[model samples]
Target chain A: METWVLGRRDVAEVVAAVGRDELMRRIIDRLTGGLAEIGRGERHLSPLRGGLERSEPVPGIWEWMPHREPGDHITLKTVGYSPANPARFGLPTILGTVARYDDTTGALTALMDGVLLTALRTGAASAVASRLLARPDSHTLGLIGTGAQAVTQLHALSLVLPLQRALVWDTDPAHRESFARRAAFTGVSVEIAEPARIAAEADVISTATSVAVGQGPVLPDTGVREHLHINAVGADLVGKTELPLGLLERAFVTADHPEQALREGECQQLSADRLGPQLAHLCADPAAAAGRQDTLSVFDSTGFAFEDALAMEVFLEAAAERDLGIRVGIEHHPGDALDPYALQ
Target chain B: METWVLGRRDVAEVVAAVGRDELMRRIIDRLTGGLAEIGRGERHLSPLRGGLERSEPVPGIWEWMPHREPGDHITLKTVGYSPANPARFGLPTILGTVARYDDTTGALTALMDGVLLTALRTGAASAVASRLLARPDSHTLGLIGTGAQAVTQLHALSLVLPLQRALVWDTDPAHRESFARRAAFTGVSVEIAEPARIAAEADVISTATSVAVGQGPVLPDTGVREHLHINAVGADLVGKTELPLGLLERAFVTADHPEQALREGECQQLSADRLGPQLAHLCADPAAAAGRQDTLSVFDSTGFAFEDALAMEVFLEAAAERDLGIRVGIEHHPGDALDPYALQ
Candidate 1:
């Protein structure tokens, strides 16, 4: 009954301990299989709005995701309005929690901070896509956003590719320079670039910008086309999209989750479900379609909740191993866990 | 800049120190205004699924929630797949978080265990509804499920309503008995009956069953219309309804959030939108229509997330007064607080 709790510092340790490489592969396996089940209409996403109704400006939205399955878990997460310039408030554009629940009973098992987890897992998914689709010769990585998430994107990328250089840029000149300075320590070449050039020339382009609208073009007409892999990280919301019409038209654009991508990601601008061979099919048998071989493969990455779950899972494992997390009294007492059938 | 970490025990002390009555008032006020803001489209509901795409069964959903104003926060919730129950897995039926963000920069200032915070706040919301909507003569509370949540329901109701008796029942009689024994310390009247009859005569009735898709009704046709005030605590998923259609037809049904209720509550089965005005307006001004005129006034409650935000705030106030809660290793670190922008 005791709510298993992990603090921010403890959570960070868990992430590093999970080993970004294993986490990425684990996420790919979990997500690929999870989606196949969903595509077959084998799952239901029920929204259990917890106490978050009172937290937002408009009570924008909050949900208790109780996915009903054998290994099912529960977690809480929220996204809010950014009021234009959110950094002035020292908050991210979004924040929430990842809860783990017992499958046999709905008792919540653990609570882990979702802020960094959200970023890490999301970046891992992109790495998963890259492993299946990016060209092996790709050496330079381009990042379009210099937010705290840039760290995760870099860490996740390191797990999948042996990168020689990283070109990063952001809207704020200060942020751009800082990203370059910090990214330089990642054992990869970090260069500060003007916004447009990173999109135009990098071998692997990762856009995690905060631009609410069309600032990032997934494919730059000026770029080297044959073997370019773009991770469209920023454009995952309805109004936010990274790619322009010209860019999407020419690239072999795919998504982490196609349905969600079409409705909310860079594909939102497109009129059709243009992703012909789905991500699952492409990753199912990587050998079939010349996986990243002399092709401009684009990963229209829109972050999902499942990655949080997996991240939490991996985090908790590390926490348990290191005894790193703090245990807080929140949900139930030791007595409450005694009888699963009992109300108390 | 440290992540403000508050746990359940700490949270409880804060609430208790702040005085339950005062916290309740704040919760009611927040819920009222929050619901109104949502109605005015002053808020936003952001859902991110990039991580879910990485899962095999893909039964996890994470969302970013933003409300319309200050004193409101954000949340991220998810429900992972229950592989044993394919019908249940991969759906974020229940998962999320709530964060109090600074208005100026949109930085997360405080974070709490939203899952537990969710249960308490929702139970408190129902308590609020019971106080304003239920008849003063209502003394006996009938409960249809004997789960851990029902205990929280009992605790929350006791805070506002002086309930002298409780009538409980579940699919498993043993579970109900166990609940009665565990809750015996409250020294309230406890009785067990078949779920149908429990719905018939009690003054205050609550149903928390999980009868998926045309199973046995929690409240039968003969008994659903008899309660003075009914809290439809269950049937929170798509295609799930606890109250019979006949009974719902005659009842003056209310909900935590009308938009959500219409989609996931008893109102889901009916044309709830066409039934009448929005629930936010009603919550904003409870006196506009005193909901306790007859036994037919049913609060078709689907728990909301904002209540947790309110609960956390209340706890902060209480903790300040009593200094009863523990501070874990959380908060915006000094390093993070040290002009991250400047560091950039």
Candidate 2:
């Protein structure tokens, strides 16, 4: 059978046609409802994700996230993260493809560029958490680490929350300044601010930094916002955390993926007894989560494979409706079973 | 940078241009010499292979095999194996792609069809094992099952060993009769035989049957050759085995991958201490392995990622020299680092 292939240009056109606000909204609905289904035992999710991390070839990681539900097609996202890409090759640090396969036959049904899709799904995941854990009246966004993810973090939050102003900060001055023009698509009023100021004033904080293990806790521990909700998106390695240990110690830290969060996220700093309910639990009962609007809360978001599968479903539907991708016979099913070598 | 994409037709063209005998010879040299390099600490093969198996998806498996050497490009093989494919969809039982990536940047450098490549690599792996573990002057061959792999198995052994005739047997009479025509490329005399006849008479035996658990030992314990070397190619699942327990107990079994062999291969039936050294260890010391040809031995060939990596290198070099594939920009590297969504 033929595989439907989508290049980055086709993906961009699809994204443009859907519009940013509606796309985020669609993803938000899926995450919120899907997690709730998982919590209530109405739906099931079996996620298998693993990768090879290399230090020899410029310190990079290549990961594969495969997800499947019975009766549904399987989806796998293969992503390569080379931190030196931006500085050396001007490419996104994260680059790869999303592949959808026929569950019964194991045939690749569709393959799409995952560069932009990852940025979208990640931001939407944060927004889903923000919608569940953050206060209803939360505004004045704080974006730390102005990079490729900085734009979508603002874009996703603006659609899901009542945000009018955003305070941005970065160690690099160029990245901090460039984020403003890059984030113009979100249309949320953004201003440059120090990390201390962002920690103190912004009602909702989102971090997407590439901070090293020893050089972290970028946000100060002295922040005094009582109703602040932070989406810690940076730390995915052991000993690497974006938020201060003091901050995580006092707040109700909610882990999106508990096992993963405990290993590499901010949850590593605190004991298991100090952790709050997971995202699925909170999403299943919004009242219990919304009741904590007056207190400090954190949503530890480590990207998940199910989120990619859900995002793939949206794109597949969109592409099918628009007839957007090329279909080619990348896989062969020759006329005779014995004559596998036969090619046309 | 653009990716060189080779569809199945292109892959077939490349295969035809380079004859099957030359391809098998090329892979054997690489596996033997490269594995020896890996063994002597002269080179390195830090291999990491993982997979996702699902009973929901027709009891199939999807595996990712990734390998790289420092300063060399990274090669990843994504293959899906569904036993139902041949009968259900008329496709090869295994299908997928091989992807080559830039080591420094993680950009996809090339993508090619893996259907035919897998068959060739698997057969070559067995041939490598046979050359190392079997009697040099061995003649008659026994193929217990007739399938796509059966043809290549005979073909590979013919190129390496002093094979003159092949005894083919399958429960399905159609498949048994069809093997003669399918294996016409090998140019070896083939005759029909029963499982007992093949086991008792043939000097070298290869089994590639889809025999289920509790339904095997496919080959019997009664008839045996003292210097017989068996390449057990099937039995990749727990409790699934081809040779009888008596035969396995009397033989010196060598595992291609000890850990994996213990878990799923025929080695699962035997104790860890009973199994002989791995392929690399044997390749590193040829005299020790060759000396064992006087006794009964089994080369348990549970395929490895490193083999795929070596095979990928051969095909990649050939494709480059021939200039046979199309180049297209599947991955995006925008002008501005901040604007990853920008696509042209």
Candidate 3:
């Protein structure tokens, strides 16, 4: 069997044909279904991901998130996050590819572009969390960073909330200045604003800053809306948090994966008792989040393998329906099974 | 930059073009050079590999071996091994692909079929070890298993050892019957025999069995040449060993990577103080293996990432010089770095 590859352009064409809004919805639906399977113990997800953190190569991290479903397939995403890459190489801060393999034989089934898939799935996760945790009548979405993540964050939240305005801010003025024009597709009127104002007024606030380790708490703790729902999207390292510890302690924080959150997300600052249910648990029982309409809540998104698995399934289905991608015999299979040297 | 893909066919073409003997020599040279670099600490290697073992569909193990070089290149080989694959599915017991990534930007530079690469490198590692540990004028190579790995092990050793006869045995008569014809390229007179005959009569014995866990110590404890060198190549699980405990206790054992050996390879039965210097350390000081020409020695040939890294470099260079393989933009890079939505 051959391995199918959906290149960057092929993925972009699928996005163009399927439309981002509809694609996000499909991913979100798949995510919700996958979570249900997980909650039911029908699927297995590996909470421990492997990473090689390097500093001599200009301080970057490359990681592999692997997960297995009930079927004869496994999906793995190998992502590289280099904060210096954007300025130094004109590349995204995060880049990677999602690969699906035959679970039994370990042959690669498909390789899909993961740069866009990463941004999209992260955003959809936030939307799924916000729809369950946030106030039903939320109308304002505030963003603390205007990088690749911020655009999708606002767009995904818009599908779930009745947001008519977006507040955007970034440490880099150039990125902040171009947010409105570049993400004009979101259809919300963008307001270039300060962090304090954005935090205090918006019904939902999302942070996507690439703040370095030991230099974070990217937002202030005081004067924020009591009923605010936050989607912290950038606290991937233990010391690289987006919300103040004071704010995290006060808010009800939910993690996509609880153990991962304690190690790398905002919950790293809090003990296990201070955490909320996992997204799958919350999805299994929406009543677990009842009576929180007038209180603060947070969705700590560090990104997980199941999300990547779901996103790969969605993109692969979309690409095939559109008759996209090419297949190549990636694994060397000899005519005689006994003689591996038969090829030579 | 686009990623170069050398699929199964492309790799076979390269093998046919370079000739197996010449290609094996090139890989041996690269392997020696890389071990020297590892000894000098000029190249970095990761001692930790990640694996997912499953017994649901059937017993199998999938693993990722990752390594980083002095330059901006990272090579990762994800392999899956299942003893059931060959008997049940007409597939090789081990199958995988190797991917090279740009360290700085995390972009994929190339993907080459690793099925052949894995066989070639494992054999090269054994050859490198034998060249250092075996008697200078060693002859008569014996093999305890005749699977895919057995052919390459014999072929690679033939390049380094002056051998006129080869003894081969297998648990299955089907595989044992075709050993001589399939590996005719090695140019040795092959004799079908039992394990006892192979252990006692041959100068260099290589074991490449798929012996299941807890059912090992496949070779008898007694009866072996005093100066014989054994390349234990098949033990990858914690309890899956090829040679007997008594034999391993008396023989000086060396590992490609020590920690990995204790966790999965044959050395799991031994303590840390009972081990020899690492392969690189021996490569750095060949005199360390001196006076061992008259003693029993075992080279625990557990595969490592650095070998795969060297093999990837060799294949990528070969494919480029021969003008083989195709290029494709596997990664999704947006025009506007900030606007991930630009793709949509």
Candidate 4:
């Protein structure tokens, strides 16, 4: 089997070709199926979660991933840090590879560029959220921050909503201009606006700021209202948050992974029980949410292995179809026929 | 910057060029330095162990190794059912992978075949054993159950001892003959003999078997005299065994990983407190035995992550020095130009 590596351009092109709405639909379907497959008598994944639980910059807050296993799922995450802010440095906020292992043997079957997959699936995950919960005529999109994730979020949102206008704001004034220019390229009328204007006017809002941990809320205090759907894409880790803690009560809060959200999402905004249901659980049974209406819905995407797995599969499948990545070297997997124990 | 994949041939060549003794010496040095680097403070490794707790057929074991600031070590392993007897459907009894991550970024820097590394390091671990606690003139050897591991045991033993002759036995009969022949290629006198004979005469009696739970010991009722060293390389799991649990007594018992051994080793033969001073604590002073004259000693091999970690470094470093692997793909590592949150 072959694995593909996609860059930012390739990812954007893939999203455009596949059509974001269709992609999100497929993602939700696959996720639902995956959850069923895993929860049922079937066993699909056994990931190993082992990362040093050291405080990135603090004490109560720390990166907690202690290598344990379902053995395969890993989503390359770099949010909370800016990858696109070139002035800061020439590096991605999060950098890594996402691999798929054959269920039979623990062979790392596919290795794809995680950056593209991360952006694509996260956007796809949000799109899934918007479709299942957002109001039918939800438009007047507002995006709190416009950075690397912002572009993909817009791409995904554009596919889901008939968005004619987008209100955007970034902490940096330069970022706002860039956001407007980029959003304009997508044919959405994006304007540099205040948080209140964006929040009050936008029917669907997505917060994509790369705010550091413990920063004040980025979303406007206007409070979520009926008919407005919000995809709080940032503020994933414990202290890093976008929406206000109390604002959680104003909307129906949802998460990609329930456990993750309780530990790393806006649910930190409230006690675990108040986070409602996981986005997957809700997606699992669409009827769980009854019908999409004038209700403020939230998808606090803290990220999970499932989305990354699907994104990897999607990216790799596309890469294989196009015959893209170089079959250059054997870095991890076993090499062509040699007694790996041989002396030379 | 670049990760390298090495097959058995590559491993053998590297070890051969450096010489097993030197290679192990280097490994020991690194193992010690790595121990100190991790600031063991007194406790060298974070002892979270569980391998046989998973699904079916000769289940693999897992050891979580925390080192200095680099990354925790993970050893995933399986017990070999003996290849010569594979009409039992013919398969390598043991197969798996060891993954090493960078503690800081949580990037998987190395993923390689665990089989060969298991062999090499199980032997290297024994080398640590022999160096720390073994008879000085340990020459004649008795190997119980001749499998691939026995080959490693013999190879590692040869690296430390001036062996004149060695005796081997296997329940399958064919295993012993083939095992002896393989050992002959290593320029050691190899003889197929009764289990009792080998057990009684060899200075260093090693058992590398594939026995299931509640099975009979490979050799019983042997007179284990002073200066006789036994390397029990099998029975490193909850229910697995090679020795009559009784043999643990009268002999100064040691294990690769004490905590693991207590649950998985011959110590299963004895109570926890009975298995005093783990193999690691012994390494600190090591004067307790030091190739002592006329005192029985045994190193029960439970296969620790320390050895695997050492082997991983060796393979990665050697593969790079020789330019041996094909750079087929990229793994996320420190400072890689990618976004982290993209995975979400």
Candidate 5:
């Protein structure tokens, strides 16, 4: 059996060819298509849960999401969160790998970097959510934290809305400054502003800070805009959330996966029954999603496995067209089919 | 950032350096050490469950087992069982990969083949169980169903006992014939026999057949010997068991992990409260394990994640000493420590 390993550089090259707007468009299409499959009883997907958890010097969550449609495609995305990675090691906080298998035989056909895929899908999911729920003419984006996710968030949002300016803030002055410099290159007017002003001024606000649970509400509650859309991106785990309870309580809330969001997203702080329609349901019906545009809407952006699966599908298609990726022999070739013990 | 891709051949070369007996011994030592750490509250492990399940043409279980100790090491083993692999593709029934990380920083340190490591550790686990539970004076061995696991069963048992003969039987005549031919080369007297004779005649019997749950009692109702020890090695899933309920009821049963055994092992057929002792507990107290040798005893080998971790530890040590293994960059390395988005 062959296992293809697509490196980070190669993935970036492939993704770059697709461009940010097209990638986000493909992501929107995949999620919408997958939800349509669910409506048609043509997909089998396991929610993003059942990961092994460990806390030593740092906390980590390692999980796999496996899914299969009516075709011969089987996919599994193995991802983990190591919160202390950036400072301690020159690595991103989230690292992942995706493996694709032939459903008829269970042979692993390909494996690739999931870190970039994850970020892209995450950003795309937010873009899709904003398109469905955010005001169409919204132009300003408030980025509460300048981390790895910040770049993708801005790129994805710009594709969906008329995003012309961004108000960015980070506790680390160096981080926000670096973010401002990068955003300027993207041709979006960037400003390093105070947390309260960023939160209160922008048409759309995204929070992606690695703040501890209970120590949050980092962007002061200056009474959110009348028609604001906030992408709560960073608060994923049970004891970790970015948005204040007041914001969640007052906003029209939607999640990637409601059951998971209630357990790990911003909704975990609220009652499970209080959650509004899921993104899947909303994707299936746009008129209903557009009806709630005139109120405070929060898209709780906890990552989902199906999103990763869709991202891989997009990546693999692009890579296949370009003939990119190195083939690695992850499985042993047996001289005799029944005997795997005769390994040389 | 460096993910080492150790293929099947490389893993075999590394494992071959430490002979089978020595590898089994090392595995036994690792388990004991890990369990000791558990006793001291220095290690944290999530029990093996929470796997994503899918059934297309065949059934699949994809899962990850995460673990951490007091040291700088954190580990995750991603494993899956594709039941149709052997027939549809010439791949092993199980396929897996192991990822190790720096606990202090959360950077992925290594990625290696888990298929070979799984087989070795599985064999070693059974051997350790036998050392702690099998009778010391046992001489003859009966192997029911010779498949991929049968080879390791014979090798592992030989390390823990003075086995002079082996009575082998399989539903497939070719498998038994191959097992008999292999046993001849191993300097053991081999006989191709019926399942009943293999069970009743040998001092110790091991059942490693892929038998359906309800259609079993594969080895007939020939009463087992008073001092016989049986290794139930194959019935790992929920509705798969090699032995009859009567055999498990009559024997003093010990499991690798009891909670898991009740859900997936032979113990699933019986009541959860009927479990005798855990292999970990038995490893901690040899006197207690030795005392149960006089009666009919069964070691329900369901396999554990820690065993795989230990096997990898041994394999990595050997690889490091020999300067083997190729380095693959699994995680993206950023030029600037604070900026992860600048990955070109």
Candidate 6:
């Protein structure tokens, strides 16, 4: 079988053609299916590793998420953050690739740039959580970090909620300006504000910043609004968190994966005794989660492989329909399979 | 940077062009360096997972081997075996792909067919073990199984030892004949012999067969010659073995990785308390390994990521020098990186 190689533009075009609402619905659907499968002991998720700290130049997570359901596939997402990448190399620190394979024969079918998909899936995951755990009508969103992912966060939130305005803040004024410009395209009134002001005014707060371990609690406790939903996105690695520990204690917390949340998400800051349920449980049963949405809800989003698989399913289908990628012969052809010494 | 995609032929040409002796030497050197780095805690091997068996149609190991040394790179090998593949799809039972990335920026550099390289590295590992643990003047090689990998086994053994003759046997007559024909190119006289006759005659015996978990050993204990060095190459996963349990008990055993061997290699069949030192220890001190060559010695090879990383270094260098492989854009270009919405 031929392996389709999709570049960043190809993936973005697919995502664009699919539209955010449809993509959000499909990803949410897959996440629900995956979680149900996990609940039934039909899913396999290898322990997350690497994203090595210290002086390591490239630190990222190597993950394998396999679903046993027929027609589904396995995906390996190798991604990391080079903290100095944007500054030193003019590259994104969070760059990587995803490979999807046929679960039956282990044949690699598609390879794509992961950054764009990662952003969309992550935003969709939070949107899914917000739809299930946030109040029926949420209007204002607080975006703490105005990095590349900030755009998706705004678009995905709008897909699930009726947002009229967004209060955004960033450590870098230039990033905040860039985000404000992009937020206008969503037709949502974008206001440049301090972190505290944004936190207090918005009904949903999404924090996606890089913060030091002990120096954190980027979003202080006093500024958070009552009954607000928070998408904790940046504290994805061990010892890196965005929201303050006290804020998590006051909320009904849910995670993409509880065990992973405890290790690398916002739950790392809060004690297990006070930790809430997982997003999977909520995805499995929205009513149970909806009952608790009256109070604060935090979706500790560390990202999941199922989300990636879902995005890949959509991206691959669209790419095929549009003939959008370069087909490469990565798999061995049956005739030449045994003749490794033969010329191409 | 553009990611170069190398297919089966492209990778094979590089390997063939590099030649067996030089490739073997480079692999041995890297394995030694990797071992030393392991000894000093400089290498990180992510946990191995997902070679699940049951009614599961597809299952195999997903591994990530990262080397921190200067000029080294990161490798991800996703491979699996489907027993029904050959008959159902006319494909190899084992299939997969490898991705090599720049250690510094986490940018993918090369993508290649993994089966060919997997065969070479696996064979070279056995050869390295044989060179270190086998008697230097060993002449005859007994190959218990004649499969695709058997060819590499014969060639790699020839590179390390002065082999004048090879006795080969396989359950399938066609496979046996095919391997025998290919073995001739290695300049070693290949003979079709019974398993017992081959096991008892050759000075160095290598077993590379796929057998059921609880089946009787492919190479029976009674046929193994005294003081013969065995490279137990096949029993790589949990509950798979080639050498008889009794033979393992009688021989001086070493593994590519002891902890792994105890779980997946030949050592899995033996008592944990009786398992021998690891290949890293042996590679770290060849003198200690060579001293035990007078007695029966077995190297339980379950393949390592370091060896793959090493092979990738050589294959990548060779491809670059020869201007082989098709370069494709996989990562985001900086100008377009900021615009996730841009069209190709």
**Candidate of highest DockQ:** 3
Candidate 6 structure quality by residue, lDDT tens digits, A110-208 = 889887777778888888788887776888989988776777788888878899899888887777887766666678889888988887888998888
lDDT of each: 0.58, 0.79, 0.85, 0.60, 0.73, 0.72
Per-model TM-score, in order, reads 0.73, 0.96, 0.97, 0.77, 0.94, 0.91
Q: Over all chains combined, what TM-score does candidate 6 have?
A: 0.91
lDDT winner, 2 or 3: 3
Candidate 5 residue B175 C-alpha distance from true site, Å: 1.5
Interface DockQ of candidate 2: 0.61
Q: Taking the tens digit of each residue's C-alpha lDDT, what string does model 1 give over A1-344?
A: 45677866776565467654565556555665655454445643333222223323322223233333444544444333342334454455444456565544344567666656666676677776777677766787888777766766776787678888787877778777666655554678788876567766677877776664444453345655467777888743356676666767777877666666776677776766577455555555566446455677778776655555656676677788898876655442223431211222
- Candidate ranking (lDDT, best to worst): 3, 2, 5, 6, 4, 1
Share of true Cα-Cα contacts across chains kept by each model: 0.12, 0.56, 0.74, 0.09, 0.34, 0.44
Question: What is the overall TM-score of model 1 with all chains considered together?
Answer: 0.73
Measured with C-alpha atoms, the lDDT of residue B120 in candidate 2 is 79
- Pitting candidate 3 against candidate 6, the one with the higher DockQ is 3
Model 4 collision count: 47
Q: Which lDDT tens digits does candidate 5 get at residues A1-344?
A: 56777787777777578775686678767877886565344654445565655464466565557665434656777666766667766567777777776655445677788777777788888887888788899988999888878888887888779989999998877788888666654578888889888867888988888776566876776766788999889854577788878878888998877877887788888898888877777776665577677789999877766777788888888889898888777565555544545664
What candidate 2 gets wrong by more than 4 Å, as runs, is A46-48, A56-58, B42-48, B56-58
Candidate 5 colliding pairs: none
Q: Score the docking of each candidate (DockQ).
A: 0.18, 0.61, 0.70, 0.19, 0.47, 0.48
Q: What is the TM-score of chain B alone in each candidate?
A: 0.74, 0.94, 0.97, 0.82, 0.91, 0.88
lDDT accuracy of residue A335 in candidate 1: 33
The model with the greatest lDDT is 3
Cα lDDT tens digits for candidate 5, B1-344: 56777776777677568765676667667867775555345553446654545564465555556665434565667666665666666666667777676655555677778776776677677777777777887888898877767777787778778989888888877777777655543566788889888778888887877565465766775767888888888753467777878878888898877777787788888898788767766766677778888788889887767777787898888888888788776555656544444564
Top-scoring candidate (TM-score):
3
Question: DockQ ranking from best to worst?
Answer: 3, 2, 6, 5, 4, 1
* Better-scoring candidate (TM-score), 4 or 5: 5
Residue-wise lDDT of candidate 2 within B1-344, one digit each (tens)? 78788887777777789887898789888888877886787766545456667575356666667776555567777777777677777877777777777766677887777777777777887888888878888899999888877877888899889998999898778889888888888889999999999889888899988676667887888768888999999843466678888899999888777877786678878988898877778889877688878788898877777777788778878877898878766676667766766664
Report residue B333 deviation for candidate 4 (angstroms). 12
> On a 0 to 100 scale, what is the lDDT of residue B20 in model 3?
89
> Model 2, A1-344: lDDT tens per residue?
78888876778778789987787778778888888887777765545456666564355667777777655677777787676677777777788877788767778788888777788888888888887767778879999988878778888888888998899998889889888788887778889999999988999999988787667788988855898999998753466789888888888888877877887688878898878888878788776586676788898877777788888778778888999888767765656665556655
